[PDB]
Amino acid sequence: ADTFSMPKHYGKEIVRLHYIPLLDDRNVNDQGIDASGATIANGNLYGSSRDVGNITAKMPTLTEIGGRVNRVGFKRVEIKGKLEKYGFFREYTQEQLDFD
Amino acid sequence: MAGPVDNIKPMKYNDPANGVESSIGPQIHTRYWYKRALIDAAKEAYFGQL
């Protein structure tokens, strides 16, 4: 196991960022102009799908005139970590050590 | 109340401090911190000296 030294004046939580790739199902977005031009609710280009029929239907195709087609987007995620405290004590008397 | 029609809608920076979050995702810091605190001045005494 590895040890991370938390700073002093920054609360009791740690936060880290995570970046999602393009072709992934966690990359939900709204930049969804399709191959012919239409706002659809899918901006990740069939991400994380291994079906051939589904794959050869969202491929980005281009015509000789170009145009506003095949837009994409990206997202982010965050993760957290926490802390806590522990301890215990013991007590005794003086005659116990002397007369044992 | 706002600007003209968008008709484009790119990856923007919609106001995250209140309401609509963002295009990329969650933010860490949404405000700068003034590190010098504002302290009121002390009062004055007129009777102690006499």
**Residue whose C-alpha is closest to residue A34's, from A81, A83, A67:** A67
Resolution of this entry in Å? 3.3
Question: Is there a contact between A76 and B25 if contact means CB atoms under 8 Å apart?
Answer: yes
- Contact assessment for residue A17 and residue A76, using Cβ atoms and an 8 Å cutoff: yes
Q: Mind telling me how many Å the CA of B20 is from chain A's nearest CA? A: 14
Chain B nearest-CA distance from A90, in A, is 44
- Chain CA centroid to CA A14, Å: 14
Cβ <8 Å between A31 and B25: no
* Alpha carbon distance A69, A60 (integer Å): 8
Residue A37 token pair: 């031009």
Residues 6+ apart with CB under 8 A from A37: A67, A68, A69
Q: Which residues on chain A are in Cβ contact (under 8 Å) with B28? A: 15, 17
Q: For residues A6 and A15, what is the distance between their CA atoms, to the nearest angstrom?
A: 11
Which chain B positions have a beta carbon within 8 Å of A31's beta carbon? 9-11
Q: How far is CA A51 from CA A13, A28, A56, A57, in A?
A: 41, 19, 9, 10
- Main-chain phi, psi angles of A52, to 5 degrees: -65, -45
- How far, CA to CA in Å, does B9 sit from each of A62, A76, B6, B23? 22, 19, 6, 10
CB atoms within 10 A of CB A43: 21
